[PDB]
């Protein structure tokens, strides 16, 4: 599956939301 | 000296790290010096 | 040699008695005083150097003081094996050399 990073602007914040596509995180807030 | 053979002057402390073959980003400056450096295998950001 | 100390002094066991050394300002006044101990037919062992510092292997019962031209070696807690001759010694600027006293044959009764 793909690993795509969701982020606001780095200047705004450094928090990240990692979306795993084509993968249920049963596997791997 | 005779302290009312003899060595161990001063106090010594240093740091040792190890290297790894990992990609880095290198932000050169207008003077060609490295200021920003972000890893690639560190975290999602 | 030039210094002054009695040839022998006597005392009881386990009591308190010092041993004095009368010098001058040329040898005691501006120089440090050292006290050595020697036993019959053996080698002189340093008791105290500068009169307030004790070498390695010297009991804490030994002390000393420098009052002007006089130097006292305070000897506390005398034992049976304390009977030895104590040498007062100082540097000399007049002769610019190493000088010693006559020696103090202490006797513990």
């Amino acid at each position: 599956g793909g690993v795509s990073v969701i982020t606001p602007g780095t200047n705004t914040s450094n928090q990240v939301a990692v979306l795993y596509q084509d993968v249920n995180c049963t596997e791997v807030n | 000296y005779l302290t009312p053979s003899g060595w161990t002057a001063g106090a010594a402390a240093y740091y040792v790290g190890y290297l790894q073959p990992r990609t880095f980003l290198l932000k050169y400056n207008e003077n060609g010096t490295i200021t920003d450096a972000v890893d690639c295998a560190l975290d999602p950001l | 040699s030039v210094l002054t100390q009695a040839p022998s002094v006597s005392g009881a066991p386990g009591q308190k008695v010092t041993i004095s050394c009368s010098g001058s300002s040329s040898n005691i006044g501006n120089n440090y005083v050292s006290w050595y101990q020697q036993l019959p037919g053996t080698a002189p062992k340093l008791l105290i150097y500068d009169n307030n510092k004790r070498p390695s292997g010297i009991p804490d019962r030994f002390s000393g003081s420098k009052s002007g031209t006089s130097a006292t070696l305070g000897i506390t807690g005398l034992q049976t094996g304390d009977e030895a001759d104590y040498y007062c010694g100082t540097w000399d600027s007049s002769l610019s050399a190493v000088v010693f006293g006559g020696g103090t044959k202490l006797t513990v009764l």
């Binding site: - | 000296y1 | 040699s1 120089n31 080698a43 040498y87 002769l95 610019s96 050399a97 020696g103």
Partner: protein, 120 residues
């Protein structure tokens, strides 16, 4: 700490000769401790001689025994030779080797080598 070796040993000479005194050291080496010497005649007191000067970095000699007594130093094998000459009657005595701290400002002879008698 430090083990001092014999200075000369059993040395006996008839009148009209000269003898050395090679003070050996162990645990330390030679150019890190200053040498000194003491005449000690049987039934007599101490008579300082030789010596290394903490000031001037020079190797002293007794003002009463200048010219007569000299010294050399071999730092690798740590042999400090003390040469006597012009033998006289009252020359026979124990010749103690002693040492002071390398840096400076020391009057004490804490380690020594039990001295050496000579013969006149």
């Amino acid at each position: 700490e430090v083990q001092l070796l014999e200075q000369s040993g059993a040395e006996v000479k008839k009148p009209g000769a000269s003898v050395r005194v090679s003070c050996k050291v162990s645990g330390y080496t030679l150019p890190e401790v200053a040498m000194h010497w003491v005449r000690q005649a049987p039934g007599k007191g101490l008579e300082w001689m030789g010596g290394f000067d903490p000031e001037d970095g020079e190797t002293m000699y007794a003002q009463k025994f200048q010219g007569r007594v000299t010294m050399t130093e071999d730092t690798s094998t740590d042999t400090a030779y003390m040469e006597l000459s012009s033998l006289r009657s009252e020359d026979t005595a124990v010749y103690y080797c002693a040492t002071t701290t390398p840096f400076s400002s020391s009057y004490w002879f804490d380690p020594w080598g039990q001295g050496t008698l000579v013969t006149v």
